[PDB]
Design a binder for this molecule. Structure first.
Ligand SMILES: [Mg+2]
Ligand SMILES: [Mg+2]
Ligand SMILES: [Mg+2]
Ligand SMILES: [Mg+2]
Ligand SMILES: [Mg+2]
Ligand SMILES: [Mg+2]
Ligand SMILES: [Mg+2]
Ligand SMILES: [Mg+2]
Ligand SMILES: [Mg+2]
Ligand SMILES: [Mg+2]
Ligand SMILES: [Mg+2]
Ligand SMILES: [Mg+2]
Ligand SMILES: [Mg+2]
Ligand SMILES: [Mg+2]
Ligand SMILES: [Mg+2]
Ligand SMILES: [Mg+2]
Ligand SMILES: [Mg+2]
Ligand SMILES: [Mg+2]
Ligand SMILES: [Mg+2]
Ligand SMILES: [Mg+2]
Ligand SMILES: [Mg+2]
Ligand SMILES: [Mg+2]
Ligand SMILES: [Mg+2]
Ligand SMILES: [Mg+2]
Ligand SMILES: [Mg+2]
Ligand SMILES: [Mg+2]
Ligand SMILES: [Mg+2]
Ligand SMILES: [Mg+2]
Ligand SMILES: [Mg+2]
Ligand SMILES: [Mg+2]
Ligand SMILES: [Mg+2]
Ligand SMILES: [Mg+2]
Ligand SMILES: [Mg+2]
Ligand SMILES: [Mg+2]
Ligand SMILES: [Mg+2]
Lengths: 124, 233, 87, 66, 34, 154
RNA sequence: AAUAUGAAUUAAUGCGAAGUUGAAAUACAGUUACCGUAGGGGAACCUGCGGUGGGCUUAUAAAUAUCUUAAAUAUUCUUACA
RNA sequence: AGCGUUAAUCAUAAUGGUUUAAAGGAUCCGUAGAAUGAAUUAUAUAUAAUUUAGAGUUAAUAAAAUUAAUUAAAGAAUUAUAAUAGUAAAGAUGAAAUAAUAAUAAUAAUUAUAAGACUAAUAUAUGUGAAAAUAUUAAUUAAAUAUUAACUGACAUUGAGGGAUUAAAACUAGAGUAGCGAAACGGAUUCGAUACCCGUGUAGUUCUAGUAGUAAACUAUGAAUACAAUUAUUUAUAAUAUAUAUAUAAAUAAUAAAUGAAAAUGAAAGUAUUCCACCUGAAGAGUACGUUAGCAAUAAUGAAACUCAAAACAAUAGACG
């Protein structure tokens, strides 16, 4: 904190980002292939059965991706696109399968927030 | 204790209130306080003379002001260690008042222990009203004591009848002694006269003392007997 | 001599106000009797009056007869008597 | 006659004349001027019809205060 | 560090010491001749 | 020197805090100039040469015989239970000494932060050294002197 | 030569799950706790040696006290007296 | 005529801190510093000539006998052996036992030898030392305080790297080994007792020569300079007319102000200036890998992934012991 010390490398610490999604490799989505599809127990104390999956991305690295919505159509080989969200209650899963695209179909009978899932406009 | 802003800024705080309309009516004191402002300047002021002696506080004796040789015959050619230290605390700390008379007083009561036994009233009568010519010792409002002697000594010193202080002191002492002897003779002869003309004193001083001792002795005796009994058991 | 100034205390007060009362007469008599019965065998008539005196003492109750307020002056005068510097 | 040499609030330094007999002695010309100033303000509030309140918790002070 | 916080550090240090004690023969084997 | 100047400023601040009336300072030329500038702006009540022990009544010439014991006595100033000389922060510190051109000084005067100096305030005084002569920053601008921005009093 | 990836087997560590064994720490935590270090023990830990307080400043009595006009005088006094 | 979302960028607190929350290096010494650093005048931040206030040098006069290293002494006790006389228990513990205890004659007592290792009071670690440290005595050599006189003339401060010293434990040699005492074995305790208690008691503790360079190496507070309001204690210095009341310093204890998250700091944690060290959420981690050094234990250097919205301090009021 002396003037000399400041000159030879000292100052306020600066943080930009540590990247929330490192395996995604600085891009919005990556295509992947599901390996297995699980049902995870959440962290204490909120409880459910979370429909996560394991996905090998095109870049190579493997990732535990969450699957949102009520109903999920995902096998052991389905084409699936991954984005950089985070399932907060499940530890060690830092990704979401984006749901309109790929073999993952749009969530059925969705009325609210349709673009957040795959749901098309019902068209009367 | 921090210097309080809020004890002296009273009228300002009320003036603000009056301006606002928090106060509808002005206080009785408001105009008076405006007329006669507080000090509000709580400084440490420096002092340059000792008032009792008349010594100078602020000044420093220089090397050029001391040309002649010192004790042990060395000429001062440099400032010493104390002449470089910044003596500001002396300007601010209040002066110890010293008098030549205090030493004389101390001497007198050493020489005359039994003058202490003469009781002294310290409750002052009007100090401005008095007007003592110390040509003589016996002043009217003042009694005869060591103080009067000392005042006489000081007067002699001032007038330069005795240039030396000690001689003046001795002279004052000798003046005092004669007066004291006269006082002593007065009382005894007055007592004799009283005895002659059939005056009757119920309790003499020595008799009083004996009586006083007697009560104490009686108190002691009962206690002492109890203590002896306790010791036995 | 070496003066000893205390720090600022919460409350100047004697820790325990022992009163220091005199020992009981009946107990003393009993001790004396015990001492006598040490000597002179079990119950010889050298301690004939002592036993009677003990009995007289311990007739109504086992003991015959059945506080120091120094806190008030210390408590009162602590704040004065301190050499605590000004506020 | 001020308090004592060891019981000195140095805030009051300007008022004191010197020390003597192990006692700070209050400058009395200063005392006089402050007294006059105080006396004048006392007179003023009495003239205006203000409520003057004399506060004196020490032992002997009561009668003179009343 | 409070004492409570220090106790975690102490525990860690103990574990490390234990690990070192365990892996003495293994460490020796690794060190000599390579 | 600039360290000395900083020390005297700190001493002034200390004296303002406790409300002393009359305060000693070291007897140098720069220091004297600074004191004179303060006096003229109106922060000091008095300024007078003197001994280490006190201010001098009569004139005493300063020589190698005196110089070590010589001192600059300075009267401080108070009004309505508030000291006049509140602060004495210096700007050109010994390690990062700053020297402005006339334009920069003008900008500072007109409410522009320059070289990380907060621009000068309503009742403030930024002193400026220019060819070993301390001035007000406004005075320096008027005369057009590129100078060292010394210090700041408020 | 340096760098990168792979390796049977293996170690540390994290997260979840609250199972088992003790009960080491927090109060004098029921052997004061911790630092360094050494040896021992299923596991927390135990023991030696010096250090530290972030534990004991948490500190609070062997007791005795005096004489001058007690009043026709002090006690009363409302800008008087002098 | 986009709206969401993801991936990114910029802004969003250093107009910061490190006694107790992350953070003062164990300590000093001292090199570089493109770090900082007195006075006056004159030259066109520098040169030059003058100054002595910082920093030194040498005397003189007072004091002080402390800290190193080395050499030479003293002492209470302890254990062991032997003798004397003497009699059945002794020693231990919460209470008990086991044991080189005791009917081979002990323990206690009195003597007499030897051996190591420790240093009761004074003692406050006051003080002294850079810090580790340092109180039985003496000697030697080294270093040390204050004030005067004279001299030097800014020669200073701090100090990356570097260097030296650095408790206890540990290690390598060679002596030494009374007492204590990791480990080990045995006796208790306990449901169990790899413990707390007791008994044998080896390394170790001791010295000589080294290695190593860490500790709650702590005032958990880097060094230096200038400055600021009081009181009480001692200590030393000077004057006073040797024992008085005074002027100085120095330390210690209470505070004012000020600072502070508060606890509290109090001539510093205040006001300022200079220089160095160090910190930037918690876990993972002072770990791994690598390198250097070491006889070794290890010491220094010192990452990342993975995972959380935690984690920490001062103080408050309870409950609890
Ligand atoms: Mg929704
Ligand atoms: Mg919709
Ligand atoms: Mg910390
Ligand atoms: Mg190779
Ligand atoms: Mg493998
Ligand atoms: Mg159990
Ligand atoms: Mg324990
Ligand atoms: Mg206990
Ligand atoms: Mg426990
Ligand atoms: Mg315990
Ligand atoms: Mg236990
Ligand atoms: Mg063990
Ligand atoms: Mg221990
Ligand atoms: Mg505790
Ligand atoms: Mg405590
Ligand atoms: Mg910024
Ligand atoms: Mg802080
Ligand atoms: Mg330190
Ligand atoms: Mg540290
Ligand atoms: Mg030091
Ligand atoms: Mg001793
Ligand atoms: Mg240095
Ligand atoms: Mg030690
Ligand atoms: Mg050793
Ligand atoms: Mg050995
Ligand atoms: Mg044992
Ligand atoms: Mg070495
Ligand atoms: Mg270590
Ligand atoms: Mg360390
Ligand atoms: Mg230590
Ligand atoms: Mg305060
Ligand atoms: Mg601050
Ligand atoms: Mg304090
Ligand atoms: Mg590496
Ligand atoms: Mg290491």
């Amino acid at each position: 904190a002396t003037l000399n010390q400041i000159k030879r490398g000292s100052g306020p610490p600066r943080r930009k980002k540590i990247s929330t999604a490192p395996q995604l490799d600085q891009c919005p989505q990556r295509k992947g292939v599901v390996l297995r599809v699980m049902v995870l127990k959440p962290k204490k104390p909120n409880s459910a059965q979370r429909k996560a999956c394991r996905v090998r991305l095109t870049n190579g690295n493997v990732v535990s991706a969450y699957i949102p919505g009520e109903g999920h159509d995902a096998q052991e080989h389905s084409i699936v696109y991954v984005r950089g969200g985070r399932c907060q209650d499940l530890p060690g899963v830092k990704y979401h399968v984006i749901r309109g695209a790929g073999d993952l179909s749009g969530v059925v009978n969705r009325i609210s927030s349709r673009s957040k899932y795959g749901a098309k406009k019902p068209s009367k | 204790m921090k210097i309080q802003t809020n004890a002296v800024n009273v009228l300002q705080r009320t003036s603000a209130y009056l301006k606002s309309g928090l106060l509808k009516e002005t206080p009785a004191w408001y105009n008076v306080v405006a007329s006669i402002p507080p000090s509000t300047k709580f400084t440490r002021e420096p002092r340059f003379k000792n008032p009792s002696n008349g010594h100078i506080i602020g000044k420093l004796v220089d090397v050029t002001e001391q040309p002649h040789a010192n004790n042990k015959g060395l000429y001062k050619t440099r400032p010493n260690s104390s002449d470089k230290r910044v003596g500001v605390k002396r300007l601010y700390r209040p002066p110890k008042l010293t008098y030549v008379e205090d030493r004389l007083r101390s001497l007198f009561y050493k020489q005359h222990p039994w003058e202490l036994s003469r009781p002294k009233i310290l409750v002052e009568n009007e100090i401005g009203d008095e007007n003592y010519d110390w040509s003589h010792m016996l002043q009217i409002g003042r009694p005869l004591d060591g103080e009067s002697v000392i005042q006489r000594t000081m007067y002699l010193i001032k007038t330069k009848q005795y240039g030396d202080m000690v001689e003046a002191y001795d002279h004052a002492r000798y003046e005092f002694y004669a007066l004291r002897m006269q006082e002593e003779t007065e009382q005894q002869v007055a007592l004799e006269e009283a005895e002659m003309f059939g005056s009757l004193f119920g309790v003499s001083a020595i008799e009083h003392g004996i009586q006083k001792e007697q009560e104490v002795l009686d108190v002691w005796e009962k206690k002492v007997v109890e203590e002896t009994e306790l010791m036995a058991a | 001599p070496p003066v000893y100034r205390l720090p600022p205390l919460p409350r100047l007060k004697v820790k325990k106000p022992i009163i220091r009362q005199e020992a009981n007469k009946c107990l003393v008599l009993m001790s004396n009797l015990l001492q006598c019965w040490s000597s002179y065998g079990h119950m010889s008539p050298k301690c004939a009056g002592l036993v009677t005196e003990l009995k007289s003492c311990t007739s109504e109750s086992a003991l015959g007869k059945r506080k120091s307020n120094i806190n008030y002056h210390a408590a009162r005068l602590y704040d004065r008597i301190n050499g605590k510097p000004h506020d | 006659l001020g308090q004592s040499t060891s019981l000195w609030r140095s805030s009051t330094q300007s008022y004191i004349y010197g020390e003597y007999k192990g006692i700070h002695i209050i400058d009395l010309n200063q005392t006089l001027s402050y007294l006059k100033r105080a006396a004048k303000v006392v007179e003023g509030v009495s003239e205006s019809g203000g409520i003057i309140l004399f506060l004196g918790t020490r032992q002997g002070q009561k009668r003179g205060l009343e | 560090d409070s004492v409570m916080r220090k106790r975690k550090k102490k525990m860690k240090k103990h574990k490390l010491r234990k690990r070192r004690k365990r892996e003495k023969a293994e460490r020796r084997k690794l060190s000599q001749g390579r | 020197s600039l360290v000395k100047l900083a020390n005297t400023c700190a001493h002034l601040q200390n004296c303002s805090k406790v409300r002393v009336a009359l305060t000693s300072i070291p007897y140098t030329k720069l220091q004297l100039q600074f004191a004179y500038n303060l006096y003229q702006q109106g922060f000091l009540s008095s300024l007078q040469k003197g001994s280490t022990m006190g201010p001098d009544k009569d004139f005493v010439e300063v020589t190698p015989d005196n110089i070590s014991t010589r001192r600059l006595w300075v009267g401080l100033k108070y009004r309505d239970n508030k000291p006049v000389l509140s602060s004495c922060k210096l700007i050109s510190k010994p390690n990062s000494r700053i020297h402005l051109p006339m334009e920069d000084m003008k900008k500072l005067c007109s409410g522009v932060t320059i070289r990380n100096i907060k621009p000068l305030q309503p009742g403030e005084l930024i002193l400026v050294r220019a060819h070993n002569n301390i001035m007000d920053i406004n005075e320096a601008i008027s005369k057009k002197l590129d100078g060292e921005v010394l210090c700041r009093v408020k």
